[model samples]
Target: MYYLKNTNFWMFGLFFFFYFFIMGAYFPFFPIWLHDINHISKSDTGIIFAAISLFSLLFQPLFGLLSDKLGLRKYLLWIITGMLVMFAPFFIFIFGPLLQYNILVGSIVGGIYLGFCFNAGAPAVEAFIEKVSRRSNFEFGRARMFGCVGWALGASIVGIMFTINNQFVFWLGSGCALILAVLLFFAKTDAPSSATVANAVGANHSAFSLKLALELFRQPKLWFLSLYVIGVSCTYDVFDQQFANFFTSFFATGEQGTRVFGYVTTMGELLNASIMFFAPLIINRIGGKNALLLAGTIMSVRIIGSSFATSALEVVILKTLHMFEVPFLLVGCFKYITSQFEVRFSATIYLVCFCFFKQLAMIFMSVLAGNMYESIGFQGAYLVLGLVALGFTLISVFTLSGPGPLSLLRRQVNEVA
Candidate 1:
């Protein structure tokens, strides 16, 4: 009975654990490895990573729509797992030969496959989580926090492995991911039933149609929320993508200083992991509306802090500010989106908004960072990013301060019911 009640939570938790574990092992260190070990330049590595985001932006929504129409995410999950397992060997072979000529065709191909697998998982998992929570009456945050721990574990492990050798971490990451795939294969698939009471409350077992994507724009609050998300992504991507490159230049000509950058970034990820769990507690206290306000306020503080940092240590100290800033913004956005939409459309809407904003931000940031890396270098580049953060904070304040589409829709639904 307990297993029946909690099966989906356990499934999704393990899924998220492996999902983020792979990400932790790969995402943070991939650029560094490509640049230093694979002999790719900083600008080229950024462009290739940006290409991964572009492909995800284009393909993931289509996959989400397909999953919704089929009403069977298990098949998609299996496919993603299979594709990732098969792609690992290509990385090992190409990191040596193809990397010599500054050609990233192999990484490009691998990244597209990786991006598809990565984005395709979200809607399925999100829909499952919503269904499970409604049935079990469990707080969603409690279940989701496990993924955060997975991410931190992956990051710390990869960092330590990289200290030994960069390729060593990739092999370790591949092994963990394959193990995760096997576990996913063995997990049972329990679809949400239309006739259930949980379905009556929030589930829609009907095929999710493409028209729903267009309908999203009719909600003014959703529009505002979508724009705010783009703004936030633009701010965060600038830092996440640019910071390490910024520091190597900032500290200037010391092996110990280079090592310190790794330590500081690992520390930041640890802080980020903790806040992912903690943000929900604060949200419970303040409520979603106030939580959104607090997220914006925190971004404001991070921008101010970044602007003041003059040394590598100062940059690390400033980044501790993210302990409050990033998770407040990230978890708050997820909670707020779930509250506004039903489970059927919830994942699609969230993913659409996320992909749209992130892709747009990447276009600007990628070009800007490359140019700045050429001209003013890391310090000036990062200061500009700090200003961009401040600009987004103002935009968030304006968009979220009053009533919008979300509030009106709630009122209309209440009146009809």
Candidate 2:
């Protein structure tokens, strides 16, 4: 019904589906490709991964800040998606050969390309979607769930193909990126009617100011939110950095393990897609801060449980627990920011607190993470990560607060208006 209600939803849905489909193919298998194929050492692989974040840390915020400052409709999103079209060819032609010949230089070059195209640009994509969701009177998750399907579909297909050759996955990604670029090229990101203007948090023209964007740094709540984002969200993300390697280690063969994990991740992403639809309802019922607290606790559970896993079945149980965390944290985190802060710089706030700072931490932490995994191993590193996530989640309990009536009133009003 809703899909029929707006044709833009189909376009948006397709964009999300194909864009994340590209992500699914990229994130899970890329590390394994580096470690298994290129024969990069664990620590060097870590630096390679960190270098991606390093490049992202340099650019992701700029993407968001510029998006806001320029009042972009979807141009930044277009720029990045267009760049992703080159990704498959680059990896196929450049990344592997360069890395094999010169690990240090290859890592840097690959990182810069990957960062500008896919990794760093994600928050810009997300910010635009969130803005659209707000102005259009829909939950961001409703649209985002389609992305889950794309991701799940991509993972399921690639998991089997990966055992044959990992490079095949990148080709699949490149094809999807082309599809995404086409959809984005024709898609409508602006409001359909001036009637929806009241639904927006603030006027786009009045809201954007470089001075206000800079002033966002002076706020304390933003920093407090960053703690949970960094400690819990980033840790959860960090655990995934080399997870395919760890996951496949339990199997009879790395190939078998990789194939299986692809299926497992596929299942998780599909399950998560469903949760994305309902996550807003549950978050609203409980409140934003509580949702994050619950989300953080759940993240800690999955990370800690993975530490003790001695078998594939045990690992599956632990990894599948990840399905619930993302929707809750993301929905809550967005709600928290909008509720507490002015709506003008939602892009700036979200990119900084959620995406940019995480990348910033990852730049330094990525290397430390690789070293930690090297010395203490995956299990030991997971234990420390889980504990840190637990601590940060708890600390946010004092600092973070519910959205109160304003959120309720605005959300309900938007629903009816």
Candidate 3:
């Protein structure tokens, strides 16, 4: 049994459920809320998002390093969850002031603090999973699926609430986040074992040294795979950040249209989530690499389909493709990336690269999509991104054959030594 039957997996799942629920609530609607409710412009909204990413990029590594030095993963987890609980009210209470001023400087500053605090839990959770699981890589997918479900549920519920009143929707999201934090507070998990203790002790001396982390970066295979992973994430960044806005605009004229569009997005998230729960079964049959290949191909197809949709009806039909592509790609990516590195530092490095590239992609997409919309409108942007998706899908297949960049560099260093 890869998991203990006691409280470990169950508590872990609960943590993921709430952790990502907050993430879902924030990602899909935060930008729109800033623009619509707070009266911030599109450009500034993008800047706010970027600022959040920038803070996360700076702070997460520090937290990861601290966790390693303390040899206390649980401490970091508790701190992070508590920080979120404290900050939830700020997101709720500060909106009126932000709107009153017609400026997001205060909100943006709060967002940066929230982003930094929010990211602290992720690496700790990841490290906790790695510690508790007997077969860390395999069991992680099932636990993480719970997060996907939570994200879908949170986003959908908020979408519905938005129809009634945007205030209620925002508060509802804050409530969910608070509830999630509280649940994490009470979550009972297994203690780190002897091997984990020894490893943590050794890691304390090595963790904060950027030289060691950068040393790992020199491997060609790791670089290629990381870069490939970055490309895949770029596609995801564009969709995650832009899809809600895109859909809302596409069907802007009527409440019915907006509701339907919201439902379409909900369906996509649900479909994507559903696939995550079943991903292990598919991986068993086709293997992880083949499963990843299948997912990349589906992403290409979905992007193409998204481009052709001229009406709400078309969007629904096209979104059905999400069922296969989204979860398949996500679970597959997490599976493959973890397989490449030692679990100790893998989560930190993986998240860092992921956050960095995905944020860069969001910046690029925001600028490029706006330009495309002005020049040739929505269809043109979709078409261009769809083609970019195809190109990256091919790159994924080609790169999967080689060892990772870090792996190769380590080999060369050993040889020279």
Candidate 4:
């Protein structure tokens, strides 16, 4: 009731819910669709998936700059959602009758185009939500939790849908995107308040320039932190991009693999949802730096433990540990950036530090992970990634200093109260 009193809150909450619902269906199962129905190879799947990140790296920053220039964040979001809906049907065409004509070229071209369209507006949505949260005094974590819930629900249902028809996955995602586009029409978009406007204008001078961008790299701490974030992201990419195939391999059955993969991913998302809901409190308690350290430690254990899992059940159990790992790292990083920068520059900073850098790492590693999975096998690859995660964790824990972003935000909140 308290949350419902604010229109912006519910609008954003619903938007996130449907956004991740589509994502839940798309991210894990799309590759499965490519492999099973489309009959693409692992290496090519990696290349196709990497294409999304490649386009994402190119598009997100430009989207951020354009959103600032136009000052129509919500309008930009609507356009992107429309594009996503429009692009959905192409998958059906490409993988269906078109596959018979030119399998390799169709798959490669379709993958790159789909990735570009689907990912192009992502930064705009994030920037929009962050802007809304700042203007409305809403807790970003609360809004973000709905996304996790949507992802869990979408993933779990997809497993059931696979029993009916695998093609339903693409249709379902498209349907959700269609619904999201409609919802965006009704969502409120308020002009920045006076203080917010001042901040924006004041911050604009340094917002995008070669000199300011160069200044970021001049700080050794940021370099170390950037490397640390990249390391953690590479590890995440391995699981995110490869886990469905990995589970299928371990189970050696398509239906059973899809069911278990769906269930395991759902469980992980449910846990992540819970963690996100309580993230502010957790960050306040542990301090942001400590939270990052804790996240890295959990990741190390999770990755290593996953490498040793001999059964689908073992892997499912091990994957739940990711709940603890992702929230701290994601929310902590967000808070860190927001704390260190002005609200106006939040999107640019986020796209650069979080989205761009992480995606850059993922692009390289997605291809490498595929190659490694083909060469050394899943277990060996996981072990290698786990060790890499551990190395970065140690580097970050020793080198980083001071209260993290969430801690600072909590302090500010208390002072205001």
Candidate 4, 1-417: lDDT as tens digits:
547687666777777778877777777787677777777677666776666676777776677667766553467777667656754577777544454345654556555645654566655676667667667767867777666588788888888787578877777667776666456667567767655475456344335555555666665656766777788766665666776666676676787778768887887765666667779867767776677888888878877887787877777666677666778988777656555555554545555566688888788788887677667677788888888888888878777657743555454453246
State TM-scores per candidate. Answer: 0.76, 0.81, 0.72, 0.81
What lDDT does candidate 4 reach at residue 320?
A: 72
Best by lDDT: 2
Tell me how far the alpha carbon of residue 91 in candidate 3 is from the true structure, in angstroms, after superposition: 3.0
Q: Find the number of clashing residue pairs for candidate 4.
A: 0
Candidate 2 accuracy as lDDT? 0.73
Worst 10-residue lDDT window, candidate 4 = 407-416
lDDT of each residue in 201-235, candidate 1, tens digit only: 55555544577777766667676767676776565
| lDDT score, candidate 1 | 0.61
The whole-model lDDT of each prediction reads 0.61, 0.73, 0.60, 0.69
Candidate 4: C-alpha lDDT: 0.69
Which residue pairs in candidate 3 have backbone atoms (N, alpha carbon, C) closer than 3 angstroms, thus clashing? Answer: 219-405, 219-409, 220-405, 221-404, 221-405, 222-404, 222-405, 222-406, 223-405
Q: What is the lDDT of residue 224 in candidate 3?
A: 61
Q: Which order, best to worst by TM-score?
A: 4, 2, 1, 3
Order of models, best lDDT first: 2, 4, 1, 3
Q: Please report how far candidate 4 places residue 201 from its true position, in Å.
A: 9.0
